[PDB]
Amino acid sequence: AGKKVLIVYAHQEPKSFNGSLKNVAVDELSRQGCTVTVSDLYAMNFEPRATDKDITGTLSNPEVFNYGVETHEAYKQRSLASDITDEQKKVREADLVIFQFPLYWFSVPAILKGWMDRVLCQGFAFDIPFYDSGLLQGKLALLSVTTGGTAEMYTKTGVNGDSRYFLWPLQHGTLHFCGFKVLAPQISFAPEIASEEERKGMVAAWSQRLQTIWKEEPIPCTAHWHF
Amino acid sequence: GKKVLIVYAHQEPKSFNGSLKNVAVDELSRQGCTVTVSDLYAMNFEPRATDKDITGTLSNPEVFNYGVETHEAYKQRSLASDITDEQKKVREADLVIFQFPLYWFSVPAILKGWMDRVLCQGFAFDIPGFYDSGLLQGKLALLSVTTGGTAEMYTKTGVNGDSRYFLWPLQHGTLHFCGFKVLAPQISFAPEIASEEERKGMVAAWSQRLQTIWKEEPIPCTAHWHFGQ
């Protein structure tokens, strides 16, 4: 009872296939009785750049600027920019964080990379001394990604290599590092090339999966699993 | 008459990344290379991929698709001038160096947005016309990366796994995809942790390698190189 879900959504176009996957997730989780929140990064015009503007008032060291150190101190002293702290409050509350994005250069769009860079700061998401000691432990995360390339292109012997290869920085380097349990990713291959029956199939496979995500076991987020 | 582009992503000129950038400029300049630096934070480079990147009529205003609309805008010469400025720098370069701190096992978002917006279809690749037939064929690229984690942490049985694991999306998914020959990356491990002499050692090791980069062969940018299966 009482689950909270955050969808971090990174697509420019509401009528896009990513938009449809986002809306189906909202409708399905909402129908289940979940509390749902969406961060529509493009709609918020989310700032992706990691700068000194992220710290309100005086800097820890004005002579030489170190983003990691200065955000860590600002977090502790409650003087991070309000857009960062609004996102952190959403993450703190969520039991599950879904990231919904098109694959850009085997990775996340820059706007979503900037959300990770700015929101997941030391003191909040991890400290030194991460992974299993990571501060977001107990939370689930699940990447829902769309690609331009077909499934066949993303195999061990295909041009792009296994899709698990590009997931490692996101799943292990980021999500696991912060203490998340990672659910198996949802990959919708090459929707722009797909038939309208296929696109419907992939959208329904997504909603079908959402009906039972609370029963899913996390993946073993290991080198072995990805490689 | 070699031309070099450094795409540089650090907020602070006094940083370790700034030092590596400066010795690259100094050393390449001393050899007689033509050198350009794109200092992204200093340019306040726009990382977001939006419809502002296209001037003039969208091909399909009703449903906006960034890849389609930028491809068409490239061909029509209606991309925003900050994108076209960077493309002219890439077009002219024999060697592109990326210099950046590792952020979440990847590039900082500002540099990610440079890749997302500069390397568009028609310019960097076509469908078909990618990997070994990518449009930037004949050009060299080199990642010069700094990390918070030490070398021990970035081994096969280290906490982070091998450093080559995180290089795949950049080296293969992006640089090789666009037709670049990729040189072996320069990784400067954990400079904030290092001693004064070890930081100097790492700077001098970069300088020293640059003296001879024109003699280097590219790596085999393969799954086996990155992953050893």
Ligand SMILES: Cc1cc2nc3c(=O)[nH]c(=O)nc-3n(C[C@H](O)[C@H](O)[C@H](O)COP(=O)(O)OP(=O)(O)OC[C@H]3O[C@@H](n4cnc5c(N)ncnc54)[C@H](O)[C@@H]3O)c2cc1C
């Ligand atoms: C900078 C950049 C870098 C990229 N790098 C990579 C990369 O490294 N690797 C890779 O594989 N790809 C890459 N791509 C391709 C990219 O991942 C795809 O273009 C994207 O995933 C397609 O998803 P979409 O939401 O944008 O689809 P859309 O084009 O918006 O939708 C596909 C079709 O589905 C339709 N649709 C919408 N909703 C529904 C619904 N309810 N039911 C049925 N149909 C519907 C739409 O009308 C549309 O025709 C890159 C693209 C860009 C722009």
Ligand SMILES: Cc1cc2nc3c(=O)[nH]c(=O)nc-3n(C[C@H](O)[C@H](O)[C@H](O)COP(=O)(O)OP(=O)(O)OC[C@H]3O[C@@H](n4cnc5c(N)ncnc54)[C@H](O)[C@@H]3O)c2cc1C
């Ligand atoms: C959002 C974020 C995400 C991150 N994710 C990762 C990650 O996934 N993995 C990881 O390993 N790390 C990660 N880090 C750490 C990051 O990679 C390091 O902080 C960065 O690489 C350190 O490089 P720097 O240039 O900033 O060093 P600096 O902060 O500048 O410090 C290095 C020292 O070298 C000194 N120095 C400068 N020039 C010279 C010179 N000429 N000779 C001798 N000494 C000199 C400086 O004064 C300084 O004391 C992350 C950091 C942030 C903020």
Ligand SMILES: NC(=O)c1cc(N2CC2)c([N+](=O)[O-])cc1[N+](=O)[O-]
């Ligand atoms: N269709 C594809 O296979 C494709 C398409 C694009 N662009 C056209 C959308 C990109 N990409 O931009 O990196 C990459 C791939 N890819 O398989 O690595």
Ligand SMILES: NC(=O)c1cc(N2CC2)c([N+](=O)[O-])cc1[N+](=O)[O-]
């Ligand atoms: N020093 C490290 O070990 C380190 C430090 C940082 N931050 C403090 C600079 C990050 N990181 O930001 O995810 C990651 C790692 N890491 O090895 O995966």
Ligand SMILES: [Zn+2]
């Ligand atoms: Zn892991």
Ligand SMILES: [Zn+2]
């Ligand atoms: Zn390759």
